[PDB]
Amino acid sequence: KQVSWKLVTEYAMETKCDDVLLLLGMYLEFQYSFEMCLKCIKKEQPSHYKYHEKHYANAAIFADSKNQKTICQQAVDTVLAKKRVDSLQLTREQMLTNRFNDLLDRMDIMFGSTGSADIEEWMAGVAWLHCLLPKMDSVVYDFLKCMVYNIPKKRYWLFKGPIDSGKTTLAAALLELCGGKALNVNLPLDRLNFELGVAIDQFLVVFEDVKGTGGESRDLPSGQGINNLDNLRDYLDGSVKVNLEKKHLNKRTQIFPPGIVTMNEYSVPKTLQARFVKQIDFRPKDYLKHCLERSEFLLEKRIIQSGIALLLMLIWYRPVAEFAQSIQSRIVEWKERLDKEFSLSVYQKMKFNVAMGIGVLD
Amino acid sequence: KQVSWKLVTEYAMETKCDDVLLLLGMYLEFQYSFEMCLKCIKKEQPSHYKYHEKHYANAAIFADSKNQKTICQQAVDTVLAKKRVDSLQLTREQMLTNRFNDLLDRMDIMFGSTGSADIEEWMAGVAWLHCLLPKMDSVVYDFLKCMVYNIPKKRYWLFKGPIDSGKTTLAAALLELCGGKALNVNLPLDRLNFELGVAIDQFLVVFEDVKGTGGESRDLPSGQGINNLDNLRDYLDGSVKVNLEKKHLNKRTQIFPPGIVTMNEYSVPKTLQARFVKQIDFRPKDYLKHCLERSEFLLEKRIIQSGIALLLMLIWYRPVAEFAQSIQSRIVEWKERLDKEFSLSVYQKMKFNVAMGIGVLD
Amino acid sequence: KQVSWKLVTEYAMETKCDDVLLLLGMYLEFQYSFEMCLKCIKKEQPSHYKYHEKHYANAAIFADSKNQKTICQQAVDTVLAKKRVDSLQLTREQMLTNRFNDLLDRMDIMFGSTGSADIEEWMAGVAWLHCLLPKMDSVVYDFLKCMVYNIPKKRYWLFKGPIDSGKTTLAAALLELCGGKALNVNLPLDRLNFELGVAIDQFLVVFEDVKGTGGESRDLPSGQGINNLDNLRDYLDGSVKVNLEKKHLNKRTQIFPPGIVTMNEYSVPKTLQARFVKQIDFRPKDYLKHCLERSEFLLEKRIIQSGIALLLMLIWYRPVAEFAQSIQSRIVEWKERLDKEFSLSVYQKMKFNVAMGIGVLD
Amino acid sequence: KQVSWKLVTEYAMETKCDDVLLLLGMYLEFQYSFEMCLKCIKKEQPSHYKYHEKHYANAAIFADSKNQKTICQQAVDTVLAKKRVDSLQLTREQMLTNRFNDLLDRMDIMFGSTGSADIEEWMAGVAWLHCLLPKMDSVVYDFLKCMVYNIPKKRYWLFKGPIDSGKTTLAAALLELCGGKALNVNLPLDRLNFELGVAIDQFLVVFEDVKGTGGESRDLPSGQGINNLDNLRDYLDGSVKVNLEKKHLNKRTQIFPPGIVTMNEYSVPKTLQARFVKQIDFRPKDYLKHCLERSEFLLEKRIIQSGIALLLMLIWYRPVAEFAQSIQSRIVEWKERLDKEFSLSVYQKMKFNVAMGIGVLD
Amino acid sequence: KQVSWKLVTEYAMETKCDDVLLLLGMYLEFQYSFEMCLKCIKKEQPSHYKYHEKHYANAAIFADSKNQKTICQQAVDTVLAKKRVDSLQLTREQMLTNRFNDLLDRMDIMFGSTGSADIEEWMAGVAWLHCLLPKMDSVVYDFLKCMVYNIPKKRYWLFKGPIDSGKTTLAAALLELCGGKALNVNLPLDRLNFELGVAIDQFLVVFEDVKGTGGESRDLPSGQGINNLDNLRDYLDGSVKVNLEKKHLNKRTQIFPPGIVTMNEYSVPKTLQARFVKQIDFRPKDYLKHCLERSEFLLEKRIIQSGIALLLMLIWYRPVAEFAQSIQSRIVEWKERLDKEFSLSVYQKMKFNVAMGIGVLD
DNA sequence: TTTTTTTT
Numbered sequence A, B, C, D, E: 001k002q003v004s005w006k007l008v009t010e011y012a013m014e015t016k017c018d019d020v021l022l023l024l025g026m027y028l029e030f031q032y033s034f035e036m037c038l039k040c041i042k043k044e045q046p047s048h049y050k051y052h053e054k055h056y057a058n059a060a061i062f063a064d065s066k067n068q069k070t071i072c073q074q075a076v077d078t079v080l081a082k083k084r085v086d087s088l089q090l091t092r093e094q095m096l097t098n099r100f101n102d103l104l105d106r107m108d109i110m111f112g113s114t115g116s117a118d119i120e121e122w123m124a125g126v127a128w129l130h131c132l133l134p135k136m137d138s139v140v141y142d143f144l145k146c147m148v149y150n151i152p153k154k155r156y157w158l159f160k161g162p163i164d165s166g167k168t169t170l171a172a173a174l175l176e177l178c179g180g181k182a183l184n185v186n187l188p189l190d191r192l193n194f195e196l197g198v199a200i201d202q203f204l205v206v207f208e209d210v211k212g213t214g215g216e217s218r219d220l221p222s223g224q225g226i227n228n229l230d231n232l233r234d235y236l237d238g239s240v241k242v243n244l245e246k247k248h249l250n251k252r253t254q255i256f257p258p259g260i261v262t263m264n265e266y267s268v269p270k271t272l273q274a275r276f277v278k279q280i281d282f283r284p285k286d287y288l289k290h291c292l293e294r295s296e297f298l299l300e301k302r303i304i305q306s307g308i309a310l311l312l313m314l315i316w317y318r319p320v321a322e323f324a325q326s327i328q329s330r331i332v333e334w335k336e337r338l339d340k341e342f343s344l345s346v347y348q349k350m351k352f353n354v355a356m357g358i359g360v361l362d
Numbered sequence F: 001t002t003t004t005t006t007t008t
């Protein structure tokens, strides 16, 4: 005859929600009967229909409470506490294990009985992506190994090119894949003091196509970032600890995470060059767009920005044993359906419709 | 007995109120008898007279409680929470369809028994507005589609032309028809990052005054607008989610909305030009001013500015199937109602007067 | 026994008070017996002596309470809430009608039994100010109409002229009449952003001595205001709902009020001038100064710059039907009073003394 | 039947937790059945499996409670209170003796049944560090006693050597062993004071990379460092208290702690030279870079940066009497353990392997 | 039973503790039995062992409070309130008498039977300082009287002479004796406004090492602070009250405190020279330098820095009558104690050794 | 937390 605060907490755990208003807004829906709830009937959203019928009576009494935001705040605190625990006890390999499970859990629905997606679209996706550079699957598996291990110095690859050279949209799917974020390294000095606080608890950090002053001799806007890598001595090795701030109040001490440098094709000297111990580059190879613009759903669905395509790329082109061991059955359970549905010729079809700039579908 | 907090929550939901002071003011009105209420007799506000009798009982107890702003805070939090659920979960088309239901429910009132305006004059508004630029109902439908599918790069159009060319009059009606928001461009980014924060969930946003180059002949300056938009070279398209600031609440990393930029005439970099998947050209038509000069209620009652007038245009022009798929019974009902009083000959009699710069009314 | 919170709230409505400290200070005074209250017996302040005897009974029990500031806080919210509902729902005619009722209430008090100033003196002010310009009375009415209708791009009047042309003297009386506020755009361009925020929910605004540049050719200092108004163009014509700022607060979004600009004879780009309705150029005249010299009681009582003096003039110069229907009864009452109080020989003697540069009384 | 706040307070004390979320999260884990607990079974995290049983019943009741965060804030404040009492009351020698127990605890975990570490690899790092400077153990012992006594003027050590000559490494190891912080002083002269706000209540500081001037004749980029130090004699002499700029807060007043200075081979004023107790020169050596080049696990596991290696070195070389009388017991235990785990030939060969520049292990 | 908040407030008063965490931490220690308390047994900390037995019974119940930080805040605010009362009422003479009573209590502990110090080593310091300036004891007594009478214009003292002439040593001893703060006026003109806020409610201030202009002709590095002191006239003169500010606070108005100024041999404008009462020249004395190294326990223990040392000099040299009346009783007992410990021959032997340049103890 | 501070 009172609200059970624990049931709300369990719902917050099961959803892994951490926004007090989202939690409140969704949980109130359960006060009407699940039996008539159009959302329950039409199978619209997992985070509703999976739970409505369970939480129903408590949601009704919840709708009569007077403390509603208070309950919700404690629930949000539970999930933030859980995250804080995990972020300090575990190591990067378990983190990755879980993060992949999450993506796989999603694919398990998207292409599942909802019919809400056909994976073939993403197959055309991976086919485009694979042609970005040789064995992109292997380039990624190698990058994964690196920034899992977070070994000293071996912590920063690079992407070069001119502008409009894919290195941003590539980084997007990798930032997605990791839970990383990026740097406006060109900022002015006191802004530059406190951009850095983004790095708090981040898996990776990325340099946003850093700019050389006088690069306008190459029509490159002559921003500050490459000079600023002079001051940024040690963060790329990450072998001494630092403090961090977002201005005035948001502060903590940590090691500076690894990640990826990128630049447009300014010059770079040894003192800065070696700081990103590894390098790669890409450039516009317009037929690839000619496929996309004849495969437009790839971009309408921004698939070439999404990390789930990278996971799918890795799934087919990585041997099942290469994975973390515990999950590896799920890898088989997906490998099965790629084995079922695709000949490697049909994989190649897409990759070379791509390589022609021809629309993959035919 | 006691104040039902639930009943207040309902009234806030019903009204979709989200300012705590407005809500408190509204609810306290009901504490007198609805039986005698002048505002009810006057039929002055729907948000009052529809509800006064229903809530009178609970308003009586509400008036005595020593805790009133706590009730109203929780109610306002409920409405904010509702908006946040939808922010994530709705299709863009459903969002737009809700916006239309709201507008149509006002047109019920204005042109209803309240007599508070006459759609005669608003359809003269349609006549005036349809004279602005060709096929205007059709051009609007193209903009709506581009915004609903929200496809990469296919996200922004530019309005360009001299002063008193209505480019902003049009932009204003489009913001209303969506519920969009507006932004400046002529600042250093540091503060403007917070102004951009207004976008933190908006279907549509608009920028004005590129402050482009050239212009010294046109009586126009160059400055930070054109400096800034090209500097964040993708951000307007927003291929990638990016962090965004609001006071007290978290900084939000999200896709930036689609919409419009408008300018008096300057050069446009081909880079920036390529983000504008359309540009549309505006000019004076002094006879339209003369029609307005002979049709001044078109500005006094702000009809020429209203998204309502664009919605009216789309009603009396577009075929019923082009709409969203649930609401079409509304669309049919208004199309029928219109020619209970209009004939296309009289609708052209307005277009007649308009094109001559003659006053619409006879 | 117990404090009645509603009786406190009624007094805040009755007084239209909205500072917590002012409200608290007022109500505490009711604790002593009105039966002896020296303020009552001297009839000093109406907001006291009108109410003391009613509120005394509740004030005694309030005087003991431990909650006091919270009782006051809820009341101040109730008044601020009433203002928001009103500002969102009344027409500008009704708002202005309310303003006149408040001013007329003060006038009844001033010339009541306390009688603390003489109507003879205030009419010298009326004579003095109708003297200041041709058809002064009618120009005032024309401004009020414009503020009431708030016709877009017909929203601002320019007062231009040297120092001691009286433009602030006129503008101050206009501002007291409509209850606007004053702003200073002669600022660093960012400071405008908080500064212009004071217009939130105001009826009218004035900008003071908006500086151009190069005016030292005619001994004027040079400055920013004009160029800042060029930046502010959107706010001026009242096209669309811009938004406004406060410390520790989210923005509020609305049309920006109509208003006055005062200026020395800088140059103006007609691009800007074209956006006024109308202008008045102010031209100093000797006899006014001699008149004031011998009429010192005018300035000490601040008469010539008070909106009370303007209201008196309209009661004199205008026909009854020009005012709104509700107040016309009070208008008739005030016209009736004046006609007992004066003869045109008296008022003509005043204007003759003013023309003759005498002290106004003889 | 009710939550014991005292039991949470014990846990917070025993685990020395000072983050309310870390505390909240881990305590919540205890609600699930201890008898089955996989974390306990896998003996994974000491802070769990040592405690889960004792706290279980109270943790279950805590899971219901409506007030969880308040309990945790009280608990955390109790821990912070302990740090303040200890900070103000202990001798420097006791503070060090605490840090030793804290690290020895962690070693008992690592090389215990948890098996998370291999003591042989850790002994390999000790040899490489020991070869970095002659008589390294006695150098380190001298340094520690110097910090413990903190005899004024006799307070600072100077590390000179070319880049990639290890001076950053050794500083980092020392700083981890003692818990100080580090400072940049190539800043311009003003905000040095805000920088020095860092030092408040720290045990050590390190001045990294102090730029001289004219060193650019040897490509050493010139800057503010040296001449900033030549001001600061009083801070370095440690003779009397100084004041430090915390941002947003008042200055606070204390003895400025001892520390380490590092540089490439800039020239130094005699005035500054005289403040150091002792200079250590560092030089790059081929066999070391070659040995590191082979012995990858050292760097992957960041062995040579970590203070655990220094403690192992002290234990391996130095008599029990040299350690604080209390913890000598743990020293004796660790001596016996290490002796059993390493016959001298093992260590001697490993050190000889370092000398060859081959991998340390054969 | 329930917590006595009164007993906490008494403890906070008697320890004069005004840090909430320190108060909390100290009180918590008492919760264990005083009978066995090792801190009591070893008499390590007076604020514990004097109090543990008294407060024990309440410490237990406090340890069960769910309200602990509130009890502490109320107690701590009682300590803060008493200081505001005192500063706004006490005579400067009584302030000094309080300050001596505090110092005399430390000396009772410090040379107490458990104390670490010995009176002989400290008296060696007194002999050395009496050599530092002719008539040293009288100079101190003159300075103290001047601070107590605080006579306008007749307020400020100048210490002048080359680096390593002991002026900071003497200043620090004086500053401990009286209480006060350092300040640094070498800043640029604006930040001074916060610097000077440090003076708020202080008894003394000391201006560190003000730098002049052109002294590099004598190697003296130039700076702003001399010219700033030109423009601090009313602060120095103390004739009228002034306004002071901190961060994040509104200005505070008071008489600016008296104090000391320290500098190298820059030339002083005759104007500023006129504001000082007294100039004292400090010059190097190599025979002190030779002595000091032979007497290093003075530096090691910071004896020559301390107000404690000065008070021994005063107690030695000056008549009992000269001290403030109440503490004369305590003072007599210290003179008696000192006379027991040293015959004048001991003192003579020491002081002779200093003058010889010989270790102060033969 | 933002605003003032911090910064420039």
Ligand SMILES: Nc1ncnc2c1ncn2[C@@H]1O[C@H](COP(=O)(O)OP(=O)(O)OP(=O)(O)O)[C@@H](O)[C@H]1O
Binding pocket: A132, A161, A162, A163, A164, A165, A166, A167, A168, A169, A170, A209, A263, A264, A282, A283, A284, A285, A286, A287, A288, A289, B233, B234
């Ligand atoms: N290999 C490629 N084939 C086809 N198009 C490409 C290729 N590389 C880049 N492009 C074009 O570049 C566009 C933008 O790429 P991206 O956002 O990654 O740029 P970027 O190199 O990171 O640029 P910037 O340095 O300016 O931020 C893509 O949408 C695509 O049109």
Ligand SMILES: Nc1ncnc2c1ncn2[C@@H]1O[C@H](COP(=O)(O)OP(=O)(O)OP(=O)(O)O)[C@@H](O)[C@H]1O
Binding pocket: B132, B161, B162, B163, B164, B165, B166, B167, B168, B169, B170, B262, B263, B264, B283, B284, B285, B286, B288, B289, B292, C153, C239
């Ligand atoms: N196509 C048009 N032909 C003639 N007059 C027009 C036209 N469109 C707008 N007007 C006139 O322009 C006046 C101002 O319109 P509006 O503010 O929309 O102009 P704008 O050119 O879009 O402005 P801005 O310079 O701010 O971009 C209207 O009141 C109307 O009289």
Ligand SMILES: Nc1ncnc2c1ncn2[C@@H]1O[C@H](COP(=O)(O)OP(=O)(O)OP(=O)(O)O)[C@@H](O)[C@H]1O
Binding pocket: C161, C162, C163, C164, C165, C166, C167, C168, C169, C170, C209, C262, C282, C283, C284, C285, C286, C288, C289, C292
């Ligand atoms: N038209 C006038 N002719 C002569 N004297 C005037 C006139 N108007 C005002 N005065 C005198 O000048 C004084 C100042 O008037 P007011 O401040 O309104 O003038 P202003 O032109 O608006 O000045 P400013 O630009 O300095 O604000 C009045 O108090 C009165 O004494």
Ligand SMILES: Nc1ncnc2c1ncn2[C@@H]1O[C@H](COP(=O)(O)OP(=O)(O)OP(=O)(O)O)[C@@H](O)[C@H]1O
Binding pocket: D132, D161, D162, D163, D164, D165, D166, D167, D168, D169, D170, D264, D283, D284, D285, D286, D288, D289, D292
């Ligand atoms: N004595 C040495 N001989 C050769 N290589 C060395 C030596 N000491 C360190 N190294 C290499 O130099 C790298 C960096 O070491 P470290 O940062 O301690 O040097 P540093 O002289 O302080 O450098 P810097 O002044 O550039 O920061 C080490 O990780 C190791 O690879």
Ligand SMILES: Nc1ncnc2c1ncn2[C@@H]1O[C@H](COP(=O)(O)OP(=O)(O)OP(=O)(O)O)[C@@H](O)[C@H]1O
Binding pocket: D233, D239, E161, E162, E163, E164, E165, E166, E167, E168, E169, E170, E209, E283, E284, E285, E286, E288, E289, E292
């Ligand atoms: N009269 C003196 N003659 C020689 N050496 C002295 C003398 N007085 C002090 N010293 C030495 O100078 C050291 C520093 O003393 P102190 O800080 O008081 O000097 P200072 O001249 O006031 O310095 P600063 O101006 O740098 O603050 C002392 O510890 C002592 O070793």
